[PDB]
Amino acid sequence: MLTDPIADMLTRIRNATRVYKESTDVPASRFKEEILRILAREGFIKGYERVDVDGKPYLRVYLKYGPRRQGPDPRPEQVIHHIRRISKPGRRVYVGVKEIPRVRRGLGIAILSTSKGVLTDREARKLGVGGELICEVW
Amino acid sequence: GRYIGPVCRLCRREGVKLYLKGERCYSPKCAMERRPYPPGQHGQKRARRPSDYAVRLREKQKLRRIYGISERQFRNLFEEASKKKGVTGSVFLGLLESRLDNVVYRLGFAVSRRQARQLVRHGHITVNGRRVDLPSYRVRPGDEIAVAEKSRNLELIRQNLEAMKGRKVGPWLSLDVEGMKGKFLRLPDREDLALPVNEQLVIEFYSR
Amino acid sequence: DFEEKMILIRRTARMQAGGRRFRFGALVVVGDRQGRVGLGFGKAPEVPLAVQKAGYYARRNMVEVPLQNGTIPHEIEVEFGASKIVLKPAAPGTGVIAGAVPRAILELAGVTDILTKELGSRNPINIAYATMEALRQLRTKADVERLRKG
Amino acid sequence: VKELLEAGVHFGHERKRWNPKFARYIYAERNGIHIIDLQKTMEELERTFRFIEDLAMRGGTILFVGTKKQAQDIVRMEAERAGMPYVNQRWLGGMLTNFKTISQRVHRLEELEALFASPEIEERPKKEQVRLKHELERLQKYLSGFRLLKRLPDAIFVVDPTKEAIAVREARKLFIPVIALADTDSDPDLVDYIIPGNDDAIRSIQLILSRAVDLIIQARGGVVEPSPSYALVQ
RNA sequence: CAAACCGGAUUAGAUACCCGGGUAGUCCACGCCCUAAACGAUGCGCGCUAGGUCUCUGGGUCUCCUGGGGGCCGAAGCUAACGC
RNA sequence: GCGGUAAUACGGAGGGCGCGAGCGUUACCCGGAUUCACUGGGCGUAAAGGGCGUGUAGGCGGCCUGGGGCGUCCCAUGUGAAAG
Ligand SMILES: [Mg+2]
Ligand SMILES: [Mg+2]
Ligand SMILES: [Mg+2]
Ligand SMILES: [Mg+2]
Ligand SMILES: [Mg+2]
Ligand SMILES: [Mg+2]
Ligand SMILES: [Mg+2]
Ligand SMILES: [Mg+2]
Ligand SMILES: [Mg+2]
Ligand SMILES: [Mg+2]
Ligand SMILES: [Mg+2]
Ligand SMILES: [Mg+2]
Ligand SMILES: [Mg+2]
Ligand SMILES: [Mg+2]
Ligand SMILES: [Mg+2]
Ligand SMILES: [Mg+2]
Ligand SMILES: [Mg+2]
Ligand SMILES: [Mg+2]
Ligand SMILES: [Mg+2]
Ligand SMILES: [Mg+2]
Ligand SMILES: [Mg+2]
Ligand SMILES: [Mg+2]
Ligand SMILES: [Mg+2]
Ligand SMILES: [Mg+2]
Ligand SMILES: [Mg+2]
Ligand SMILES: [Mg+2]
Ligand SMILES: [Mg+2]
Ligand SMILES: [Mg+2]
Ligand SMILES: [Mg+2]
Ligand SMILES: [Mg+2]
Ligand SMILES: [Zn+2]
Numbered sequence: 002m003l004t005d006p007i008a009d010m011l012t013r014i015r016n017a018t019r020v021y022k023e024s025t026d027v028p029a030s031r032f033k034e035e036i037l038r039i040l041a042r043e044g045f046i047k048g049y050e051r052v053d054v055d056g057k058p059y060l061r062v063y064l065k066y067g068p069r070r071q072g073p074d075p076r077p078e079q080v081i082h083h084i085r086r087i088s089k090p091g092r093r094v095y096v097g098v099k100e101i102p103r104v105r106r107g108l109g110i111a112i113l114s115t116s117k118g119v120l121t122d123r124e125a126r127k128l129g130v131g132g133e134l135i136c137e138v139w
Numbered sequence: 140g141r142y143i144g145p146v147c148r149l150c151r152r153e154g155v156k157l158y159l160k161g162e163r164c165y166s167p168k169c170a171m172e173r174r175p176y177p178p179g180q181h182g183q184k185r186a187r188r189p190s191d192y193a194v195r196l197r198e199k200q201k202l203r204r205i206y207g208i209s210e211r212q213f214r215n216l217f218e219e220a221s222k223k224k225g226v227t228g229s230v231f232l233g234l235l236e237s238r239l240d241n242v243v244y245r246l247g248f249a250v251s252r253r254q255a256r257q258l259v260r261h262g263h264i265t266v267n268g269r270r271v272d273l274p275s276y277r278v279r280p281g282d283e284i285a286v287a288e289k290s291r292n293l294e295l296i297r298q299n300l301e302a303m304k305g306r307k308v309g310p311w312l313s314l315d316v317e318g319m320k321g322k323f324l325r326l327p328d329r330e331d332l333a334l335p336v337n338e339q340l341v342i343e344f345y346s347r
Numbered sequence: 348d349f350e351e352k353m354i355l356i357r358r359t360a361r362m363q364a365g366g367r368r369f370r371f372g373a374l375v376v377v378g379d380r381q382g383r384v385g386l387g388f389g390k391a392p393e394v395p396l397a398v399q400k401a402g403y404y405a406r407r408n409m410v411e412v413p414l415q416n417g418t419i420p421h422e423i424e425v426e427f428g429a430s431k432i433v434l435k436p437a438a439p440g441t442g443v444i445a446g447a448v449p450r451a452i453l454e455l456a457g458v459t460d461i462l463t464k465e466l467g468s469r470n471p472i473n474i475a476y477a478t479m480e481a482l483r484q485l486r487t488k489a490d491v492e493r494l495r496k497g
Numbered sequence: 498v499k500e501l502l503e504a505g506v507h508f509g510h511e512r513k514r515w516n517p518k519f520a521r522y523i524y525a526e527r528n529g530i531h532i533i534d535l536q537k538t539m540e541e542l543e544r545t546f547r548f549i550e551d552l553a554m555r556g557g558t559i560l561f562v563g564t565k566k567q568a569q570d571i572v573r574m575e576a577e578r579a580g581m582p583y584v585n586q587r588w589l590g591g592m593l594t595n596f597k598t599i600s601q602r603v604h605r606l607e608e609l610e611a612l613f614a615s616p617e618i619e620e621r622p623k624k625e626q627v628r629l630k631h632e633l634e635r636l637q638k639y640l641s642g643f644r645l646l647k648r649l650p651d652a653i654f655v656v657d658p659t660k661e662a663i664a665v666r667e668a669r670k671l672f673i674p675v676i677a678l679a680d681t682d683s684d685p686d687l688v689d690y691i692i693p694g695n696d697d698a699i700r701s702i703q704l705i706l707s708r709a710v711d712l713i714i715q716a717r718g719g720v721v722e723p724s725p726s727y728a729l730v731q
Numbered sequence: 732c733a734a735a736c737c738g739g740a741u742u743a744g745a746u747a748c749c750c751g752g753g754u755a756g757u758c759c760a761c762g763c764c765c766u767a768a769a770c771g772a773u774g775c776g777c778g779c780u781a782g783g784u785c786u787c788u789g790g791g792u793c794u795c796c797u798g799g800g801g802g803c804c805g806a807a808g809c810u811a812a813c814g815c
Numbered sequence: 816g817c818g819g820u821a822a823u824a825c826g827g828a829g830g831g832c833g834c835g836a837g838c839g840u841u842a843c844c845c846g847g848a849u850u851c852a853c854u855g856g857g858c859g860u861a862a863a864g865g866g867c868g869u870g871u872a873g874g875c876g877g878c879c880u881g882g883g884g885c886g887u888c889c890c891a892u893g894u895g896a897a898a899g
Contacts, residue, residue: 002777006778006878029878031879044494044495045495072670075686080495090876091875093887097888098889106421106422107488108488114887115888117889179830182830200833210833339442343443468811513783515782515783765866769866770866772864811861814859
């Protein structure tokens with residue numbers, strides 16, 4: 002079965018971008034969606050939208066890359082350089098507000114889930130909470 | 140002072156005029172001018188490329204052998220300067236330069252530091268009007284470094300200060316002659332000293 | 348102009364009938380100490396030739412390193428082969444705290460304060476190729492903003 | 498310098514030995530053959546010919562590379578028409594990345610022809626005379642219009658990316674813009690300016706290089722007529 | 732058919748390879764034994780990431796499309812390399 | 816790793832380097848050792864996939880809504896002696 006559906010998405014995305022797709026489909030959940038809301042806001046995607054494949058509900062993510070490059074290998078720079086699940090099943094990772102990590106000196110984000118809802122690193126620290134550290138993205 | 144040996148064979152090992160003697164070092168000697176190669180039967184054959192380590196080592200020696208100080212007492216200063224807040228390298232220089240044995244040399248009471256060391260150990264130097272016979276003593280800012288009241292008409296001191304009449308003393312030191320009195324205005328900053336040491340290197344050697 | 352350093356020279360050897368036949372390799376670095384570095388691997392019949400060749404090789408293959416007050420934007424870690432290099436920014440007064448290979452490269456790039464760790468295989472050649480890759484991979488807030496606008 | 502319904506019969510080509518990366522430029526699998534998106538061939542042509550204009554205007558050269566025999570002769574005329582150089586027979590290891598060293602062969606040709614207008618073709622032993630006259634043979638055979646190059650070209654026109662892929666690779670390593678006449682067997686992303694037509698079949702090929710060289714002359718300053726090739730393609 | 736074994740050869744020797752014999756065993760039933768280069772030297776499950784080609788077995792509008800299985804080549808990528 | 820008759824590696828000498836009222840040695844602990852890897856490792860061929868299954872406990876578990884608030888997070892407050 003699908004043991005972690007968040008990693009599934011996070012990965013689904015990582016996979017798609019490395020072959021430069023225009024978009025990719027993840028099967029849908031509000032929680033998954035509530036993450037894409039942030040990916041989108043912070044500039045990591047072009048955004049997403051609830052499409053509908055074979056009558057079951059998916060979230061089409063629209064990916065985003067650099068410009069074409071120079072010399073041999075013109076494949077463009079990735080926008081999502083790096084994106085990885087931190088907390089996982091059978092190793093949940095929770096942090097105090099005093100422990101929310103500075104990712105790449107802030108050049109990257111770290112989505113975490115708090116009782117004020119899903120939030121970036123900057124968001125929670127400048128709002129006073131902590132929670133389950135979901136994933137770093139940079 | 141300390142080390143107590145041939146000093147100019149050290150000038151000749153660092154390949155640098157070190158002035159561990161003051162006066163004669165301005166003559167046609169210091170060892171360097173006329174014979175500026177290393178001491179020893181070998182110090183005149185084509186010099187092999189110094190290992191990364193030697194380079195950083197020889198550089199520390201160049202700094203320590205200037206101020207004439209045990210490695211035990213050098214490192215103790217460096218570690219302190221390390222723990223301390225600020226560019227740990229220049230704080231080090233600030234610390235060596237804050238030594239009384241050296242401040243006496245800076246204010247030209249002695250013509251060398253070896254001479255300035257003894258001038259203190261034999262009690263001719265006073266701090267804030269009290270006497271201090273420790274080369275180690277850390278001069279703080281605001282302190283006045285006098286020549287001892289009852290040492291004033293002394294031969295070594297007379298010549299040494301009629302020579303100081305009309306000479307400039309560092310931008311971090313005051314000094315009035317006739318009164319045999321200096322003043323530690325401030326800890327010098329890195330560009331205030333003109334030390335032939337990379338110093339950045341000295342830091343690297345103490346983490347080998 | 349440029350400053351050359353040379354991290355290792357070595358004396359490889361191949362077999363032909365009746366005797367081994369030698370050769371020399373040179374890893375050299377060039378830098379202007381203001382954000383430009385090049386790594387050159389020059390192999391050749393005799394030593395000083397193999398150096399010359401590396402210096403030239405090192406000048407094509409330049410990296411534009413985005414210094415900031417003597418250090419780096421983020422912190423990268425990079426794997427080249429089984430070599431891993433770990434780069435970490437440090438405040439002024441720290442110095443290049445690094446193994447002797449990325450030190451060569453970093454100092455010549457003009458990084459004056461940094462933290463380093465060689466992890467995994469320590470082959471000086473692959474370690475050099477890795478810190479070059481680490482450097483090639485640095486981004487600044489400037490170029491990240493561009494990436495995620497539109 | 499146009500023609501849109503110059504599909505003629507030179508639109509789609511190649512079966513299913515495609516590079517799937519060429520998927521955007523295809524219309525359908527009309528009976529064992531991908532046919533090329535007609536519109537795109539014309540609008541890629543837009544941005545492409547545009548490129549080449551500014552190259553002739555600024556006064557730079559375009560190296561025409563076509564080795565494929567079903568396009569070989571065509572390259573010779575259209576590349577001779579424009580001033581530009583051509584690689585026609587076969588493409589040598591380092592025409593570009595080794596462009597100095599390769600040009601010793603040019604230094605010799607131009608200088609070996611100088612032997613053949615002197616009294617020293619009667620002088621010199623015939624041990625040299627036979628060798629040094631059938632050596633000039635081969636030189637003129639590969640470098641018949643590489644010799645026109647005195648430095649690396651500003652761009653490079655290949656008629657088959659896949660087939661002349663060593664030519665392409667060398668261009669990139671020296672950052673020289675690739676123009677290419679491509680179709681379904683190629684990697685489009687490896688090419689800067691693409692004319693998604695079809696690498697094989699003279700009816701295409703020449704049409705493209707005609708109109709391209711038309712444009713090169715037209716923009717350099719000469720505004721001319723029909724070509725030495727044209728319907729002399731059988 | 733063939734360990735052991737009994738002979739013939741070969742050999743410097745030949746407790747072997749070659750040759751003529753030959754018992755356990757190899758076969759059956761029942762009961763034990765539990766090992767191996769028990770090997771893809773690759774634990775099981777699920778999701779994702781170009782294609783081409785050969786083959787076994789379903790289905791459909793049957794130039795082909797769509798499943799399951801067995802091979803080969805290869806995108807991205809990985810690997811110390813070989814390779815995958 | 817040096818020494819087999821030209822030893823910068825042995826014994827002496829001159830010279831040199833490093834510390835210095837100390838300098839060496841042996842012993843032991845952490846370090847370098849991401850060399851038990853949580854941070855921070857691996858198992859096709861380097862050590863490492865259990866011969867294969869069935870399944871007990873245990874670990875883990877798709878989408879939507881509501882209650883609870885155990886985990887998780889936050890505020891306040893008590894305790895955290897002195898020495899270090
Ligand atoms: Mg590895
Ligand atoms: Mg190792
Ligand atoms: Mg072809
Ligand atoms: Mg028998
Ligand atoms: Mg028998
Ligand atoms: Mg029996
Ligand atoms: Mg049985
Ligand atoms: Mg059928
Ligand atoms: Mg199959
Ligand atoms: Mg590959
Ligand atoms: Mg490989
Ligand atoms: Mg001897
Ligand atoms: Mg010997
Ligand atoms: Mg000896
Ligand atoms: Mg020894
Ligand atoms: Mg340590
Ligand atoms: Mg450890
Ligand atoms: Mg291991
Ligand atoms: Mg084995
Ligand atoms: Mg094994
Ligand atoms: Mg198995
Ligand atoms: Mg078993
Ligand atoms: Mg086994
Ligand atoms: Mg089971
Ligand atoms: Mg169970
Ligand atoms: Mg449960
Ligand atoms: Mg759940
Ligand atoms: Mg609930
Ligand atoms: Mg609770
Ligand atoms: Mg206490
Ligand atoms: Zn001197």
